[PDB]
Every structure is written in C-alpha cells, then in structure tokens.
Swiss-Prot record, chains A, D, E:
It comes from Saccharomyces cerevisiae (strain ATCC 204508 / S288c). HAMAP family: ATP_synth_B_arch. Pfam families: ATP-synt_ab, ATP-synt_ab_N, ATP-synt_VA_C. Belongs to the ATPase alpha/beta chains family. It is a peripheral membrane protein. Gene3D superfamilies: 3.40.50.12240. GO terms for molecular function: ATP binding; proton-transporting ATPase activity, rotational mechanism. Its main location: membrane. Present with 131000 molecules/cell in log phase SD medium. This is V-type proton ATPase subunit B. One of its GO terms (cellular component) is fungal-type vacuole membrane.
Curated annotation (Swiss-Prot), chain C:
Subunit of the V1 complex of vacuolar(H+)-ATPase (V-ATPase), a multisubunit enzyme composed of a peripheral complex (V1) that hydrolyzes ATP and a membrane integral complex (V0) that translocates protons. V-ATPase is responsible for acidifying and maintaining the pH of intracellular compartments. Belongs to the V-ATPase D subunit family. The gene is VMA8. V-ATPase is a heteromultimeric enzyme composed of a peripheral catalytic V1 complex (components A to H) attached to an integral membrane V0 proton pore complex (components: a, c, c', c'', d, e, f and VOA1). Interacts with RAV1 and RAV2 components of the RAVE complex, which are essential for the stability and assembly of V-ATPase. It is found in: Vacuole membrane. This is V-type proton ATPase subunit D. It comes from the Eukaryota. Present with 8500 molecules/cell in log phase SD medium. The chain holds residues 155 to 205 of 256 of the full protein.
C-alpha cells in the first residue's frame, strides 16, 4: 500500500504479506528519488524495513511502494579484480560495471564449505614482530588490537604493501604455491584514511589484484553493515574459482559495532550490557565463520580485522567478544609508539592458538615454535622486572635480572623496530632471536629441550 | 458494590468503584478484610489490602464505607502495645489465641470495654469552643494524669452538652457540638487521618535542649527537643542496644516507640524489658510502660501495616503535642520503611527512579520530618509541646550512597555518626566530627550559657582535638612514626581519653541511666585543661617524657572518670572532677620545673 | 650519622617509586571496572521499565 | 478451563471467574499424566498458573482443567520425621507420604502464635568460632554467609552433623531439657552432597529425628520455593503442639532467590534493582517468619539459613537484604581456606547485635560477652597492620602492631581450626580465649571492666 | 468533572481537550477544599494534572473541575518586597493582596533580555573569602558547592544578610549610584530554617531590602521547582525597568533537582545516570537563563545558586553539569568547619574565571589583582607545609616551610574567620591581607609588582 510511519531507520510500511524474507522493495519518493530497502520484519499486513539509502525524509501517502520480488543477493564475479567500489557496489571512481556470473545471498552462509581440515601453511609479511610470536596460518583469523593514539592504519598499510612481495619468496619454500589477492573493506573511515589505503595498493602495483570497498561514516549506518559482508561474498567467489589466498582486511570494527548498536536501541529488542547489542556477538560471528580453506583445497580466506579500542580497554564489550571468536590477537601498545618504535606492535599478550599448526618443517623450521616459547616467556618476565627495577633499585635486582634487562632493550630496538619497507624472512628472525637469547645460561633456558639448545645457543 | 477484578499478591484490584476516593477505607471480599484504595486506574481501583490473601476469589463484593482510612487516638493508648494498623495486640492474644494478628479476623482499633474517669474541661454550656481546646482530661496512669481530652483539629461550634464528672466508657457520649446543625456527637476517642499533617497553633523554632542521657551525644552536638536526627546503623553493630537504651535514658512526658519493620525478636525484647526497669521520673507498677505507647510491626507481617506504621506513629506524637505534652518519637529504622516503599513501588507497578527505589521516596521522607518540631500547643489556652524525631538511617545498598541516606541528610539538621571500624572494635556509638553536624548548635550553646556553663568555649577545643588527630593519623599510617611533634603526640593521647570515656559507653559505664549537662561539661573541662597545660609545658621547655611521667596520678584519674557517678558536689556538679582541676595545676608546676 | 643517612635515604627513595607506579594505578583500574558495571545496572532498568 | 497461551515457563490459562487465590488446579495433559498448578495471579477472565510438575506439554485445545476448589496447604504430622520426601512431599522411596493429623496453611500467616519473649537460652553449634563470638540463642536467626571457592557445602554439613550432638552438652548447661529434632530442606544442591547430608544424619543416629525434603534444579522453580514453606510449617507444628526445640536448617537460599527472579517475566509485577523483584524482601520475610519462641515458651524454632554469595561480595542483593531482616551475620571466607584452614571463619565483620542480652551466667559466664569483645579489637588491628606491612615495609610498625601480627596467626590456626567430628564445650572455649590474650599487658585492655578481668584472668 | 485516576503525584482528569497547556484548573471537592493544579499534558479527552497542595483524596464522581483560562504568571510589583510568601507567591505574612503591575511568565523566560556584554563592576557579599579571592562582578553566576557536612543554610543566609550593608560604603566610593535588592528563594526547607532566615534579616535590617519566598518540604514537589522560577521573574522586572543591581540567592538546587527526577511515574520519558534525567542539563539551564546583564546595563541580575553534595562526591551528576555551565565555582570543605573556622571556605580549588574583569576602582582598588595572586599561592604552600611539619618535627623544619605554616594558621584564623554579625567590606579585607603577607620578606613576594610591594608589604 503506502507508508504508514518511520521511527528512526526503521520504516513502517503497510503492505501485504506476500513478499519473502529479505525481499527488496522500492520506495517512490515524490522528490524524484528512489530508495531501496530490504524487509527486516514482516507482520500482519505491514512490514518494518531498513533503507540502505537515506535514514529520514520518508512521508505518508506521498510515498508509495512497488515490491521488486527479488531477495537481496550480490552479483559476485571473479573479474572483479582491480575494480573500485563503494559500500554498496556502485562505482565512485568509475571502475567497471558489476555484471554477474553468479548471485550469492548474504547471510554469512553462501554455500559455506568452510574448514574441516585446519590450515598449516605459513604466510609472512616479513614482519618479525608479527610472524614469530603469532604464526599466521592460511585460514586463521588473528585481529589487530590497538587503541586510540596509535597508527593502526599505518600497520594495516604495512601488511598490504609488503604482502605481495614476500609471498613469491615463500612460494619457493612451499609456504605458498599460488597467487595472493587482497580484498580491502574500509568501514566508516575518513576520506583521508581511505585514500591512504588506495595509495598503498597503487604504490606497490597491486591495484589490479585488490578489490577496494570504501564506506564512509556519513553514508547511512545501514549501508555500513552491508559493506563488510559484500566484501566477504566476493572474497569467497575468488577463493572458489581461481584458487587464491585471499586476505581480508576489515577495518574498523568499532565503526561497525556503533552501527549495530543504533539498530538495537532503536529496535524493539532490549540491548545487552553497556547499551551494546544482545545479539552483538551474532553480528560479529557472521564475518568470522567465513574463514578457512574453500573447496578444491588451494584457495582460502584468511582474516586480519582491525580494531581500535574507543575507550582504551579490553574491558569493553567489543574486545571481549572479538577475542573469543578469533584464534589469537596481535596487540599494539601505546608506550612503544610514544618512544619511537615503529611498528609499535607489543608482544606481551599477543597470542596464537593455532601457532603449532601454522609452523611446519617443509617451509619453516620446527625450531620456530620452540624459540617462540622462549621469546614470549622472556620478554614477558622482562617487562615485569623492569617496572620492578624502578621500585626496588638494585637491592632486589640480580645479576640474571640485569641480563633480562638487556634482552628487553635489545628486543624492543631491533626485533620490533623495522621501517615500512623492510622485509625479513623467517630464517633471519630465528637467527637474530638465537643471538639475543644467547647471554642467558643453559639452566636459564629451560623451556626448550637440551637437543635444540646445545646445537644453537 | 465493586466486583474483584484481579487479586495479584496481597494487592487486590476491583472494578466498579465510583464515588470513591484515593484513601478510602473499604471491606475487601466476602472475607471482609480491612483495606484501602491507594490509587485508581479508570474504573479499576488498585487497593492495598492489609490482611493477606490465601483464598479470596474474584467477583466478591467490595464495599466502600463512605470515609477515609484513619486511626483512633483516645484514652488507654499508654500501657498497651498495638500494631501499625493499630489493633490491640494484647486483646488479640486472648480472644483469637494467636499472639500476632490472624487472617480473616478483624478487631476494632481500640479496646471497647475499658472505662475511664472523665473530669470536666474549662468550658460550660453555651460556650464557644475550638480545636485542641481542652474539653476535659482523663486520669490515664499513675505517673501521668496529663491526658487532655480535646475538641478535634478542624472543629469549632458551641457545646450543646457538657456531661458532669464521673465514670464513663469511651463509646459512651459525653459531648455534643453544634456548629451548623448537629456536627456530630463526640466521645472520648477521636479520629485523625494518617495521610495529613495534624493542625497546629503555630510552629516555633527549637531552642530548648533535651538531654539524651548519653554524655557523648550531648558533648559534641546537643540534641534538642523539636529536632531531627539521623543515627547510622549497619545491622550488626549494636544499633538496637543503643536505640532501646536511648529510649529509656531520654525523658519526655510521653514517648512513642515505633518499630518500623523489625526482627520481631527486638520488639519482643522492649515489650519485656520496660516494665522490669525503672523510670528516672519515679514511675511505679510497670514504670516505663505507663509512659510509652508502643507501635509494634515486624517485617514478617503485611507490607501495608509497615507502610502505615510511621504515619500512625507521627500522629500519636502529634496528638499528645496538642495536649501540651513534650514527646520523644524514636522510629527505628527508617530504611526499613523505605524497603517497604520499594515493595509497594514494584507491587502496584509504579515507576522507580530514585536508584531502583520509589518516585515518591524523597518527598515521603520529608513529609514525615516536617510533622516533627517544637510548637505552641493546639487550642488557645497555650501550652508548649514538641516532637523530637529520632530516625534511624541505615544502609539500603551502599554505605551512605543508598537513596535513603542521601535524602535524609538533605532534610536532617542534626547528624551523629557511627563508624563501622570502631563498632567492631567496641567503641560505639562513635561520633566523628566529619561525619557529624548540628545546625541547632549556636542557639543551644547560648541556651547553656544562660543555664550556668561556659559550654561554647569547650565545644571549639573538643572539635580541634578530634579534628587534628584524623590528619596526623594519615601521616602516621603511611610514613610511620620516627618523629611526630611534641604537640602532635599530646593531641593523640588526649583524643584516646575522649574515646574511652565518652564515645565508649553502653553497658560499660555504670552510670548512664541519665547523665546531667554539668557533669559532662565538668568531665570534658578536665580533658581540655590537661591539653592546654600540656602543650605549653613542652614549648617553655620540659621533655615530653618527663611530662607524661609527672602528670601520672591525674592522668589515670581522668582515664577512670567514666565509672564515677554524682555523689560529691551538687546533684549534677561532681567534686572529684572539681578537685581534679586544682591538682592538675599543681602537676604542671612539677612538670615545667 | 652519614652512614645511617645513606641507608635511610635508600629506603625512603624505594617507597616513593612504589606508591607512584603500583598503588595509584591499581586504585584507578579497580575503580573503573566497578564503575562500568554499575552505571549499566541503573540504565538497563529504565529500558526494562520503558519496554 | 483451557490454555490460551504459555509465556516463558509461565502458563496463561483462559478461564471463568470463580477460583480461590492460590487454588490448586489440575491440568489434564494428553500423555497419561495429570499435574497440579497453583494460580499465581487471578485476573479478569484469565489466570496465570505455573504448573508444579514439568514445564512442557501444555496444549491449546487438548487440555482440560478442573478446579480442585482447595488452595494448597501442607498436611502436617509430627510423625513426619524419619521419612524421606521431595520438594512436594511426595515419596521417592515409594510409600512415605506426608499424611496428616491436622491441615495447616503453607504461609503460616493464619496461626502465627509467636511468643513475645526474646531469645533466652544458649544454643551452640560445637564450633568454637561460632559459639563464643556470635553466640546463638534459641529463636535467634543469624545467617551463615559463605562464598563459593569454598567447601561451603562441607561447612553446612558439618553444622547438620553437629546439630544434636551439641544437645547433651546443652542439657548439662541447662539451655536445653527437651527433645531435639531436625527439619532439613534442600534446594538446588549437588547429588554427592545430598548423599553427604543423608549420611551425616545416619551417623548421628538422628535419622528418625529428621525430615528431608530434597529438591533439585531439574524440578520446577515454583515448586522449589514451596519446599521450605512445607518444612517450616511442620517445624511450627513440632514447636507449638509438643513444646520441642526445633532446628530447621534451610539450604540454599541462593537457589531460592533465583527461582523468584525467573518468575515475574510475564507477571504484570515488575522487577526493581539489579533485575531482582522489589518484593523479594517480602518473599524472604515469609520464610523467615517461622523462627522464634513459640507460645508455651518451652518450645522454640531456631532457624539457620545457608547462603553462598554467588558473586562473593556482601553488597550483592541476595546477602544485603537478608542481613537486614536478621540480627547480625557470620562470615566464612576464601582467604582462610587458601592457607589450609577448616572451618575457615573470619570474625571481623561478624557480629550479632542481640548476643549480650540473651546470654547470661548460668549456662555461659559473665565474661563470655567481655572476652569476645577484646578478641575483635585485637584481631582488627592485626589485619590493618598486615596490609600496611606489605606496602611500606616494617617502618609503619610499632610495638603493639608486631604483637598484633602474631596474635592474628595464633588465633587463626589454634582457635578457629578443629576436626569435622570435633565438638566443643563453651566453658572450654572461654579458657582458650583467655590464653590467646595472655601475651598482652592488662593496661592495653579497655573493652572489659577491670572488675571482671581480675576474676577470670 | 470526573477524575479518572491518580497514579502517584500525577492525576488524570478526564475532561475534554479544549484547555491549553499549563492552564490552571480547579479541583472542586465535596470537602469544601479547592486545590489548583496545572496541566502537564493535554491529550484527547484527558489532561494530566499535578496538584500543588496534596495530590490525592479526590473522589471520582463527587468532584467537579473548572478551567481558569489563564496560564500561570506572576503578578509582579515593586511594592511586593519585604514580605514572606509561599511557593506560589501568596502571602503567609497575613499581609494584604499580592498586587500586580504586570503579569510576567515564569515558564523559563519573561522576555529574556540577557546581554551580549561581558561582566565588570564589583558586587560585594560581605564575606572576605569570596569577595577578594574570587571577585564577583554582576551578571556572573558562581555557585557555592557546599555539603551537608557544612551548615549550608547558615552560610547562605550570611551572604544575604551581610550583602546590602556593603552598599553605603560602595556608594561613598562610587561603585553604586542605584540601589541594591536581594531576592531570596528557599526550597523543601525545614520549618526552623524558614523562620531563621527572616529573623537574621530582621536583626541586620536587611528585611525590607529583600523579598523571601519559602516553600516548605511537606509542600509537593511541583510547587518547589516553581518557587525559584517566581523569584527570578520578579527580579528581571526590578532590574530592567527601575535599574537595580540584584543578587539572587537560590538554595537548594539539590532539592530542585530531586523534584525533577521525582516527577515521571506515568510519563514515557526515561531518566539518565544515577536516576537523574538525561535532560537534567536542560532543567538547570532554565534557572540559568535568568541571570546576566539586563538590557540598558546599569541594572543586573546576579545569581549565586547553592548546591549541597549529599555524599561529598564531585563526580555526582548534579555538580558536574552545573560546573560546566557556570563561570567558576566556590568549594566549601568539611575539614575547616571541623577546626572550628566559620565560614570554612577553603580557597584551595575555588576559582573566579573573570576575576580581573570584575575589579577596578571605587568599589575595589588597583592592588586587588596582584594581592589575589600572592595570597592563593602562599596559602596552597601552607597546606603542604602542615603535612611536612608532622613528619620532620618543629625542630628540624625549613625556613620557607616555617613561614608557610605561620601563614596557614593566621590566614585561616583572621581572613576566613569572621563573626556572624561582622561585615567585611572589600577595602577592609585587603588591609588584613597585608599583615599576613608581611612575614615573608620582599624577596619571597614577587607575584606582586614592586610598585605595590613598596606601598604595602
């Protein structure tokens, strides 16, 4: 029929009961504008819709509807590589028209042929700080946990430009066997931040091997939630058809969560703790399931989402849900940035669940994992001993403790400090670790077996 | 009349309640339960029913009586224990054979068999009369025959009939008033709405101090008759012991003890303890009881009664106030009344917005308070009556950040602390000068100046010793002691003396049954004199240690003060303390050189 | 007097460093944790009432 | 009449306006079993019932109701001891039902012939830390506050085993002369522990003297709350008709609190602070009402409620409200448990404010109240001195404080500690108090009048 | 004519929709008691009314209603002063009629003529701590943040009562050519307190300089918030048309705030943090809008609101919102009241942000600004010195710290301390200041120009 009311981004339509769930309808405004919307709720001769375009300016009997009769699906194609999109799949920089070779609905579950065999190959960006302490396997998800006052954008950028140079080296080792593609979805970010990402793909020569989806915050909150999902549907298509390892960078998670929250306090559902959604978990889960090896077993989807804490804590509802779903986290700290360390990624509570799985012996050493265990322990104790040094002085600081103080400094200024064009390799990282670790006696180095220790001090 | 729409908890809803108001007395069901229409939603009235439900069905009649719910105040209030809806507890024990109120059983508000001696007023026939004027008096006890029979608040006319002296019942009419046609016939009892503040000739500012009988309560900030007070509790710090103890020790013409929503054991205790113990007014044959009118609610009885408790209680203080009797009303604890209010808020379904606590809560607390105070008694012959409200406040969630306490401090002008750490250590009641204030202070110390004492001077120094000690204690804890000034040590030492002798006392002071002002003043006077002599003594040169060793004999003597009782000097001025001052002066002489 | 002065200053120096680094930030972090739960109990209630 | 609907576990009956309030109705379900439910509220042409057995099976048009015409009341016998019941009093051993000599109301609001004589004679629980410090009087209800991380079930158990072995100690003291009987109610407690409770009664030889009502968490919520009311009512019959000293041990209040909370999720009645009902206080107070000296003043009912703090803090709703209705509290603590103490009882926030008045020299001693007062002050200083000791060093210590540090440990490990099977004389308890105090001069004492001290010290 | 219901303070009267907003209505009772109320909401055949006196006890059929036809406004007049009123502005003096010359709105603004010209020219309160150290010039709104641990009413009175005895002294120096008037508003007050203010004024002879409006605390909440609104309007008329400098004293903003939190009990309006409105800002603002320079600017309306912390929390929502809006704040602390200093204004965190802007000459001196800097800085240092003295001792303290100590005791005991009936003019205050500061040499005085320092040490 026509529009009865609008309460916030919910639109109260009066229309009949014949449409399906997530059926597209179109609203004819008297302003010479058409707006699309999708049914969130269907009820007895009325529907409640969230519009992708606009959020306000919806009338009563001036505004009419015609139902499309077609449910929301993405035309996913594989010749989508090098084309530039926004947060709905329209071109904003005159990239090629979408076409179609298959249509997949968005539900976080297209065809879902995700993992029942785990990842085991290794991907390196040449960043020691990342790779050694967090061994990224070919379909694991490890987010970047950062906070305000940090250059999280810059680190995401390091990954993107240095990836696609390291990977052919890794191809020979049998870390890889196939090409790499990056699918970048930006959510709710500034023009200035958006250009930075695009600049990085141009600069490298991977503008033809990347898909870029740009959503800005001044584009509807409803447009913003569809943006990561749209990227992910496409990503699964590339993995399936052309068997490439797809890395997805989904930035920023907080922006996405703010969108969900407005559509949950404006819903007739009461939200969870701290005014953050009760199905906030679920909304996040939708992204996360879409990880692992895809049929034909040589393409995969690997995930690094980027989170900045908007309140500086792991207390907050966003870090706590995020961390449970994913398999590790890569932590960035404020202190290291302030000092002049870039990348400022700290290694104190950064952790990889599927570390063991990720390391091998046909493209990495088996000592990657043993040596990792030492670095995590030693650094961790060393950071704590330093704070303790401040308090006590030298009256509860041992000879051995002095050695931990030296390991800490050296780790910070070498292992963690490397420019944004510096490329390492796994073998080099291990060698440099071995040296630092060397000043410690045999007794001290006890979480690694005598066989290993003796050969390489 | 009305037909029960729904029964949800002890709340009954009834449709078809028209020409009804919002405080109406109603008989609910076929069970004829006492009840009241709190609110109305359209035709549907929401009624709080003061007896429980266990078998009341829908569609039973609801009969409105045609008048509000009120309480009965007549004679025989004294030397009897009632509840908060005010039905005699004692009469309930024989007839129902149930000590506490049984369900479906109803009993009228006062005893209807008891006969009283009426003596005529100061009116005769054809005289113009008004409200709170004394129409007679009834010899109510042996301690007090001060129970004046008044023409009700909001009544005037001419008295058609004055009955002569004699024995009558309190149902047996003795008075006719004609205003415009027959106003009503009157009896010994009079009715008063428990939802309205009782009329008054004028309110007057408080300026007459009551002595609590507790040296500590008088010493830092004096009580006044006509005032408002908070005493903090915590529900395991002997708050009960000091409540019951204050009641005995404080001396008023009538006292009203209102158990708001109590243990049931605690209420039982006061019922037993008071006839066994004596008054300080020479009361005989159940001494204290004869002076008290007691309102007993336990928390285990219906929530309606417990709402009603405070209101009935205040009206009783107020009734006696109009007669020209000075009243101490001790209501314990006001936080349990608030807990009953939170209960009502969720049972009717009204919005809470006072931190999970009622909308109405802050205003209801203030309304209760304003009914207390000092006044010129109702009726024109002019008397002084007063009501001092002592209302206990205690936690309802946080330590002082609970709604109850936040509201009460706003409105109270007297606050006397109670610290938990000192409570566990046994040094209750602990009054902390930071957690205590009196706004009545300035008029009160000038009152005591007229009475004889130098009192205002002693107050400032009492404050100074306690005050510096708290700040020096914080340096002691963190830094430690390796040094602490000669002067600073003295302040600490003397503050310990004040704790031990004053602040600690509740079954530890063998005299505490009533302590005069003079005696308190004399005791504190020795403490302050010891302080000034001591600080001067270190400065004019003499070691701190030599000064402790020589003061010796007197220092113990002030330490021991607390056990001593008036037995030397006057009846309020004590010679051992007067002797002490002069000996102190001699000690200073030995100590400086 | 010097030798003693030398020992005592070393202890007084440790105590300043200890209160500054450990104690004060523990009071900040604990206060904050409890604040965040606390405000939410008050807010959700109002939403429950409104629903 | 018939089910209109079911909302949560609460079942919405549509029915004609006749029933009693709290009237049992029997719901006929098509599965060979009929069940009873009680009208929780009666309303305009409908009643909302929670059915006492199961939670599923109700149908729209396949249900029938018939009104029993009688509200639930507990049928009471004083022959009910020596029988095993569940939460509805049905047998589980086949055969021992409650049966009757009289029928009495489940709320205990009709009879309520509770004596206006305040707790009088001494009671002990054979645990020195309880008895001396927060001394139990008949008719006194003082809560056991526990915390989880504890063998809190073992502490409850200990008290149940000890109850009735105390009683010959008490006969001799002349704070008992008459039979002792146990009324035992279980709510949401583990299987193993239910066998521990039966076993503890068995050992004692008081199996005949006790009634067991067993209610698990797989038995309904409404039915859970009724259980202690049945127990309580039977105790009141024991105390009143035959002038007995009745001890009802009621565990677990926390389970009882949850059950109350789950309801009101479809009632018109609305929930207050921290989602707890506002008339939760009212619910606690119905349970608590049967407790106190009965009329005849030769019987009494003493009530011990068992509370485990589910969150550990004492400002949580469950403990906070209870502590107010009761006269004092008894604190068990995690910290003692960790060192390796049993029964681990902290005494610092533990105080009973009606302790002094009840007790006198005739079954205790006059110093019983004084010697207890001294031990709190010294223990309190010892505890603050300990905290300061950690932070600053031994710089803030003073002579009294060093002595107080030793006192703390001495008290903790000799006084509070004893075997499960062990029980203690009150007079004994008092010589052990004096002993601990012997390490302090007498001039430092002040919570004892110098007269009293001189006699017993 | 038919009362529908009462839901708390809020009364629903069922009668037609033809009334306008805030039109007074009369509830006619068969008790012969006419009560007026004001419609909060008007809806289709019902209005929601809050009755000024009482709020309940009205029958549902024996009652009638009449509509006045006039929205609530204050009859304002210059002959109104020197009289005691209620919270509706109706004599309790037993005096004559209110009198009108105009009818001015009390809704929030009468004509709002609040200038776009900033504060200058000193307004003297007659309290040394406020006037010299925190100079208030007209139009400024500086609150007193006090606590219940202080005697907030007594200090408030002091400011009024000593104020306007400053004025002959100002007239001579030529600060004021036009007269000075006080508008005193008391809220939710205690009976002793209401009487106290009148008596204080009577004593000084400030009675006919001021009008006192008393709203008592047994009077319903809606009347209470109306009270300052009435006061503020009266003041804007005296200030505009007959050009007078007016100091408006409003106590207690905490009781006004409570009323605002309190109303809402059938409204669909939800509060914010700690139960206090999200719109608590808005309500504060409302009082705040009547405060500033009037048009013509020789008259002014000067506002000092008085806020009582109930629990000593500066993170309590009431002070925080206010604090942001206000041009500085006055902090009064419990500690000084405890030493026995009266008034006990610690000038330690107190500030006036337009301190320089107020002073001049002819009601100040030039040397006023420099001194304000010497005394604040020296005082702060004095507090720090007290703590150090306790530690080091008296015989081991510094010269600089010793001076700072001496200053603390004199500063407190001479500058801040003044008697109840002792007026402290600004000229008087500045002299006492030079005696205190003299103890420091010229070498330690330097936030003072050498010109001044040479005049007065």
């Amino acid at each position: 029929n026509t529009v009865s009311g609008v309460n916030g981004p919910l639109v109260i339509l009066e229309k009949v009961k014949f449409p399906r769930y997530n059926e597209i309808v179109n609203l004819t405004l008297p302003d010479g504008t058409v707006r699309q919307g999708q049914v969130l709720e269907i009820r007895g001769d009325r529907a409640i819709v969230q519009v992708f375009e606009g959020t306000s300016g919806i009338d009563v009997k001036k505004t009419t509807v015609e139902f499309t009769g077609e449910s929301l699906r993405i035309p996913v194609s594989e010749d989508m590589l090098g084309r530039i999109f926004d947060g709905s799949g329209r071109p904003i920089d005159n990239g090629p028209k979408v076409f179609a070779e298959d249509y997949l609905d968005i539900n976080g579950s297209p065809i879902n042929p995700y993992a029942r065999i785990y990842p085991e190959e290794m991907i390196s960006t040449g960043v020691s700080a990342i790779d050694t302490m967090n061994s990224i396997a070919r379909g694991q998800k490890i987010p970047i946990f950062s906070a305000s006052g940090l250059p999280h954008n810059e680190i995401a950028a390091q990954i993107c430009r240095q990836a696609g140079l390291v990977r052919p080296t890794k191809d020979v080792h049998d870390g890889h066997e196939e090409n790499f593609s990056i699918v970048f979805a930006a959510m709710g970010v500034n023009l200035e931040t958006a250009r930075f990402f695009k600049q990085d793909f141009e600069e490298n020569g991977s503008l033809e091997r990347t898909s870029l989806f740009l959503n800005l915050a001044n584009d509807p909150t409803i447009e913003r939630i569809i943006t990561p999902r749209l990227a992910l549907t496409t990503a699964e298509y590339l993995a399936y058809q052309t068997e490439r390892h797809v890395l997805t960078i989904l930035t920023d998670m907080s922006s996405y969560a703010d969108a969900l929250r407005e559509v949950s306090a404006a819903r007739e559902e009461v939200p969870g703790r701290r005014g953050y959604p009760g199905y906030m978990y679920t909304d996040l889960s939708t992204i996360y399931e879409r990880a692992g090896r895809v049929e034909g077993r040589n393409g995969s989807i690997t995930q690094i989402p980027i989170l900045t804490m908007p309140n500086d804590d792991i207390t907050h509802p966003i870090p706590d849900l995020t961390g449970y779903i994913t398999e590790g986290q890569i932590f960035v700290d404020r202190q290291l940035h302030n000092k002049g360390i870039y990348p400022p990624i700290n290694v104190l509570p950064s952790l990889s669940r599927l570390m063991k799985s990720a390391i091998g012996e046909g493209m990495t050493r088996k000592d990657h994992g043993d040596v990792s265990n030492q670095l995590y322990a030693k650094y961790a104790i060393g950071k704590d001993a330093a704070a303790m040094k401040a308090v006590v002085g030298e009256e509860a600081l041992s000879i051995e403790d002095k050695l931990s103080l030296e390991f800490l400094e050296k780790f910070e200024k070498t292992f963690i400090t490397q420019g944004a064009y510096e490329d390492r390799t796994v073998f080099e990282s291990l060698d440099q670790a071995w040296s630092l670790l060397r000043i410690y006696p045999k007794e001290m180095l006890n979480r690694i077996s005598p066989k290993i220790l003796d050969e390489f001090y | 009349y009305g037909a029960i729409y729904s029964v949800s908890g002890p709340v009954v809803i009834a449709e078809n309640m028209i020409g009804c108001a919002m405080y109406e007395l109603v008989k609910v069901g076929h069970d004829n339960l006492v009840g009241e229409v709190i609110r109305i939603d359209g035709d549907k009235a929401t009624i709080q029913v003061y007896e429980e439900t266990a078998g009341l069905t829908v569609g039973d009649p609801v009969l409105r009586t045609g008048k509000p719910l009120s309480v009965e105040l007549g004679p025989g209030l004294m030397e009897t224990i009632y509840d908060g809806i005010q039905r005699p507890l004692k009469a309930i024990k024989e007839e129902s054979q149930s000590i506490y109120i049984p369900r479906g059983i109803d009993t009228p508000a006062l005893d209807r068999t008891i006969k009283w001696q009426f003596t005529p007023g100061k009116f005769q026939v054809g005289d113009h009369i008004s409200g709170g004027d004394i129409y007679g008096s009834v010899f109510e006890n042996s301690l007090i025959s001060s129970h004046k029979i008044l023409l009700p608040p909001r009544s005037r006319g001419t008295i058609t009939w004055i009955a002569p002296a004699g024995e009558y019942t309190l149902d047996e009419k003795i008075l006719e008033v004609e205003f415009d046609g027959k106003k009503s016939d009157f009896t010994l009892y009079h009715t008063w709405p428990v939802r309205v503040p009782r009329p008054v000739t004028e309110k007057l500012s408080a300026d007459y101090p009551l002595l609590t009988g507790q040296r500590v309560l008088d010493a830092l900030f004096p009580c006044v008759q006509g005032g408002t007070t908070c005493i903090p509790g915590a529900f395991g710090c002997g708050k009960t012991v000091i409540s019951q103890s204050l009641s005995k020790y404080s001396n008023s013409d009538a006292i009203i003890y209102v158990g708001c929503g109590e243990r049931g054991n605690e209420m039982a205790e006061v019922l037993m303890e008071f006839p066994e113990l004596y008054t300080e007014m020479s009361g005989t044959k159940e001494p204290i009881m004869k002076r008290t009118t007691l309102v007993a609610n336990t928390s285990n009885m219906p929530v309606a009664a417990r709402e009603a408790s405070i209101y009935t209680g205040i009206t009783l203080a107020e009734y006696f106030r109009d007669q020209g009797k000075n009243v101490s009303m001790i209501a314990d604890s006001s936080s349990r009344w608030a807990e009953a209010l939170r209960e009502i808020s969720g049972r009717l379904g009204e919005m809470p917005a006072d931190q999970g606590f009622p909308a109405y809560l802050g205003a209801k607390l203030a309304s209760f308070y304003e009914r207390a105070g000092k006044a010129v008694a109702l009726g024109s012959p002019d008397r002084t009556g007063s009501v001092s409200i002592v209302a206990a406040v205690s936690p309802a969630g946080g330590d002082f950040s609970d709604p109850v306490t936040t509201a009460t401090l706003g409105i109270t002008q007297v606050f006397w602390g109670l610290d938990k750490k000192l409570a566990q250590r046994k040094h209750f009641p602990s009054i902390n000068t930071s957690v205590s204030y009196s706004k009545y202070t300035n008029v009160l110390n000038k009152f005591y100046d007229s009475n004889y004492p130098e009192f205002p001077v002693l107050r400032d120094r009492m404050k100074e010793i306690l005050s510096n000690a708290e700040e020096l204690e914080q340096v002691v804890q963190l830094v430690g002691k390796s040094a602490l000034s000669d002067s600073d040590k003295i302040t600490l030492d003397v503050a310990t003396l004040i704790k031990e002798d004053f602040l600690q006392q509740n079954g530890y002071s063998t005299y505490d049954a009533f302590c005069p002002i003079w005696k308190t003043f004399d005791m504190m006077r020795a403490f302050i004199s010891y302080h000034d002599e001591a600080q001067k003594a270190v400065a004019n040169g003499a070691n701190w240690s030599k000064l402790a060793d020589s003061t010796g004999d007197v220092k113990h003597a002030v330490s021991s003060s607390k056990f001593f009782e008036p037995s030397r000097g006057e009846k309020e001025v004590h010679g051992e303390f007067e002797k002490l001052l002069s000996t102190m002066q001699e000690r200073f002489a030995e100590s400086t050189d | 007097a010097f030798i003693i002065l030398d020992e005592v200053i070393k202890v007084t120096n440790r105590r300043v460093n200890a209160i500054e680094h450990v104690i004060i930030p523990r009071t900040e972090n604990t206060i904050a944790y409890i604040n965040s739960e606390l405000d939410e109990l008050d807010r959700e209630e109002f939403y429950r009432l409104k629903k």
